[PDB]
Amino acid sequence: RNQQLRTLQEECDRKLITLRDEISIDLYELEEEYYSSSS
Amino acid sequence: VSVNLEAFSQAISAIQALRSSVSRVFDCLKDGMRNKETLEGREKAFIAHFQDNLHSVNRDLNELERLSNLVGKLYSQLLQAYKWSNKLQYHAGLASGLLNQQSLKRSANQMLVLPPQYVDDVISRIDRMFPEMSIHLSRPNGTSAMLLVTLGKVLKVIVVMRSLFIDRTIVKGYNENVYTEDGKLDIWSKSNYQVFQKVTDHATTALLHYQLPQMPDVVVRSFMTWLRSYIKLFQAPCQRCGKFLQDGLPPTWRDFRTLEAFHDTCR
Ligand SMILES: [Zn+2]
């Protein structure tokens, strides 16, 4: 039971970390676009 | 070795100087005394010029003797290409320096994504040089690489990158535990001493200062070049006040582009 639950936890954390990195790259692009907007 | 090249060119100019100074002695003596209004003044001028010329001959002979004490020991197409290659290389170095000092580019506009393998290759290339710095990459949180740069028995720098571009740095002392309880890097800490908090501040200005827009290899290489100069902490005195200690601080400021020690109060 312990080993199965540890594997599920590790899968969830790998998914979250990769999500954070991709969202961070998108946030960088959006920050550049929004702050450099002329308006 | 290059020192023999410089000593030989030096002594070439020494012989030319000796020959011309001897000929200058005899040429000024050929003309004879000039007029120069006051009689006392003309005697003074002639004596002074003759004495100066003789002294210059003696100095040139002495310099030639000193270089003697210090001296050590189809085919034309290849040498012509060699000479022209060195000429083009030096010409291009000077012209590139003059032009990138004064660029006229105002904006990038007209009218980050990297494999982590590339980051490891770049940082291992930097770690191969500077034999007193060891860089140990690890990735505890995703693709953002975290670096421990140890530096002599002096520093431990924790550099937190983001896509092969330095983001944050924390400088701690040698003994200081940079690891947490679980043996991961302590990315968020301070260093219990005044000196290393000052060097964290100077390192953040260093990563704000060395900013090329596109190419990041020059940035990390130049940051490590600047960081390497901190090995003479606690040994270098300040180049403004001479002393080692201002308010109990060593000179924590290694100046960019001329790595000299200063207390930050001495700017
Ligand atoms: Zn000072």
B112: chain A residues, CB-CB within 8 Å = 25, 28
- CA–centroid distance, B254 to ligand 1, in Å, is 12
Experimental approach = cryo-EM
This structure's resolution (angstroms)?
4.4
CA distance B25 to B47: 12
Q: CA of B35: how far to CAs of B27, B29, B39, B44, B54, in Å?
A: 17, 14, 8, 11, 22
- CA–centroid distance, A22 to ligand 1, in Å, is 47
Rounded to the nearest angstrom, the minimum Cα separation between B153 and chain A is 35
Assign B262 to helix, strand or coil.
strand
A25/B113 CB distance under 8 A: yes
Q: CA of B74: how far to CAs of B78, B80, B82, B87, B171, in Å?
A: 7, 10, 13, 20, 59
Element containing residue B261 per DSSP (H, E): strand B261-262
Assign B71 to helix, strand or coil.
coil
- Token couple for B254: 């290694």
Residue of chain A whose Cα is closest to the Cα of B139: A17
Assign B171 to helix, strand or coil.
strand
Cβ count within 10 A of residue B80 = 10
Cβ count within 10 A of residue B155 = 22
CA distance B33 to B26: 13
B144 inside 8 A of chain A by CB: yes
Residue of chain A whose Cα is closest to the Cα of B142: A17
CA distance B64 to B213: 51
A17/B142 CB distance under 8 A: yes
Chain-centre distance for alpha carbon B227: 13
